């Protein structure tokens, strides 16, 4: 083996915290959350790992809501249960430095953008003309 280079998803990579949420309610909502979902999955304040292994990017979410990790390649689509208990298809790129993660489900479609502000990591995720904006610092 040799120590391979680094790359620009090196900048999410680390452990993040969530500190503010705008809108999350009303973007679950849309998404098709139910009620008692979306009241505990609301005050999670979890952490979020991010790290990369070669080709492969794992994001680990721990909560007190329900963890979940996914590992993937840019580009190649992969089955993912969400927080919520969806079963998607999922599909993550990079768009000019930002994460792109498209969920899609029974014929419905949402984005999950994540990218590098100062010092934090800021999270917007968009159905259907709602958005929510998620800001995680360093833990
Ligand atoms: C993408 C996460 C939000 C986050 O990581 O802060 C999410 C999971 C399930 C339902 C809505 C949102």
């Excluded at 998404?31 to 292994?53: C, E």
Aim: aromatic share 8%; glycine share 8%.
């Amino acid at each position: 083996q040799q120590m391979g280079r680094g790359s620009m998803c090196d900048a999410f990579v680390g452990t993040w915290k969530l500190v503010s949420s705008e809108n999350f309610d009303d973007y679950m909502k849309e998404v098709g959350v139910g009620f008692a979902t979306r009241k505990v999955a609301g005050m999670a304040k979890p952490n979020m790992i991010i790290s990369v292994n070669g080709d492969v990017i794992t994001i680990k979410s721990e909560s007190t809501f329900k963890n979940t990790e996914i590992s993937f390649i840019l580009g190649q689509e992969f089955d993912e249960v969400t927080a919520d208990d969806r079963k998607v298809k999922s599909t993550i790129t990079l768009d000019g430095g930002v994460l792109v993660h498209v969920q899609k489900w029974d014929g419905k479609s949402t984005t999950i953008k994540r990218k590098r502000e100062d010092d934090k990591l800021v999270v917007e995720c968009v159905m259907k003309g709602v958005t929510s904006t998620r800001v995680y610092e360093r833990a």
